[PDB]
Amino acid sequence: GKKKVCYYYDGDIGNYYYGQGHPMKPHRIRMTHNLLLNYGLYRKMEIYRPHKATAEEMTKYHSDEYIKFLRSIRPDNMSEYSKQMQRFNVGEDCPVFDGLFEFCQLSTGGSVAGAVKLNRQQTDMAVNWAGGLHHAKKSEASGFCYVNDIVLAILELLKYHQRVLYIDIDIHHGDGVEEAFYTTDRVMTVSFHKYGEYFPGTGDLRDIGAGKGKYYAVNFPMRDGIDDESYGQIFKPIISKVMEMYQPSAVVLQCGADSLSGDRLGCFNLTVKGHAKCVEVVKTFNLPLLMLGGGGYTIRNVARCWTYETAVALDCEIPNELPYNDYFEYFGPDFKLHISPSNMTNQNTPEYMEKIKQRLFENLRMLP
Ligand SMILES: CCC(O)(O)CCCCC[C@@H]1NC(=O)[C@H]2CCN2CCCCCOc2ccccc2-c2cnc1[nH]2
Ligand SMILES: [Ca+2]
Ligand SMILES: [Ca+2]
Ligand SMILES: [Zn+2]
Secondary structure (H helix, E strand, C coil): CCCCCCCCCCCCCHCCCCCCCCCCCCCHHHHHHHHHHHHHHHHEEEEEEECCCCHHHHHCCCCHHHHHHHHHHHHHHCHHHHHHHHHCCCCCCCCCCCHHHHHHHHHHHHHHHHHHHHHHCCEEEEEECCCCCCCCCCCECCEEEHHHHHHHHHHCCCCCCCCCEEECCCCCCCCCHHHHCCCCCCCCEEEEEEEECCCCCCCCCCCCCCCCHHHCCCEECCHHHHCHHHHHHHHHHHHHHHHHCCCCEEEECCCCCHHEEECCCCCEECCCHHHHHHHHHHHHCCCCCCEEEECCCCCHHHHHHHHHHHHHHCCCCCCCCCCCCCCCCHHHCEEEECCCCCCCCCCHHHHHHHHHHHHHHHHHHCCC
16 A cells, blocks of 8 residues: 655755756755645655765775765865876766765765665655766766765665665666676666667667676667657566566665656656656555656756655655745746657657567576
8 A cells, every 4th residue: 555755855955066057956856855845745754864974885885095086076176186087087977066075975875874764664665866876886987976876775775685676767877786786686777778879878788787697687778759658568567577587675766857858968758657657667566665866957847757756655646736836937837747748759669669678578588
């Protein structure tokens, strides 16, 4: 039936600024929070302020040198770190900004605290919209991500769970998470993403893991314009087959909203209902679930998406008419929660979708 939901948020998160022109806007986390508060979604959730994750907690995955660099670099001392900035990929995608380390600490803190709460069996679902920064590598920042909160949260879940399933619906391939667990069978990574002339360039359907991890990495490459009907047609059957064969005891779901129609960086055509259908599908398996944020660059749509997905987690129906809120003007001209898909062509033909699904099913037959 209905589940206990714990939600992680720090009121300072929305103040971190990547810089003029950078599409990553932490303010979208504050817009999501304000919208869900105005819908009354706080009445049924336990709301927690995450602790600032320590450099030591971060080094359970990242190298000591990389975390030391992140804790030391600032816009005023950048000139003395030109060498380390190149080595750690800090530059245009991953700039140095005021409070960078504290932003990482809050993003990570929410994910790890949620994983601890799930491990203690004190909640059925834990939500951290500030997390889901899937591109960060052991000693390298990548694609707007500096610390891989997902990998750290999964390592925490692995203390009490033999098998953990990671599912990523961000439009970009979840490369940092896949790479971290590529050679183990204790984590199965499943990523649905745009593939072909698109960042990060990885996630081919032939990338299936290595060594003990062979068959434990699953990639569903897609083309521009995927819609609710097409996405829905493959998501449930793939996730159902993965649940059946892998039998995970905990799940982490990265809910990157850049797979929505009208995204500034994405080229998919999902609606908020289509995107949220993934949360409904995963929730139906009744396993401990950590829901995380990720991409999303048309910020009014990110707020709508994550507000609706929090309502889905709580099994609460919310009206389409948006309640008045601190950012009401951002939701014009309609002031509605749900969005309409565009007229963009869906390059993913029904035959292509079935063919890729059948190839993934062949790989899933190889599990013990
Ligand atoms: C949070 C999780 C996530 O949503 O998955 C992160 C997605 C990360 C995408 C990284 C990718 N980066 C690139 O294509 C890099 C490699 C060559 N370019 C150069 C960097 C350009 C400047 C910074 O970037 C932008 C600035 C303005 C507008 C768009 C971009 C941009 C678009 N795509 C990129 N960057
Ligand atoms: Ca993905
Ligand atoms: Ca794996
Ligand atoms: Zn993305």
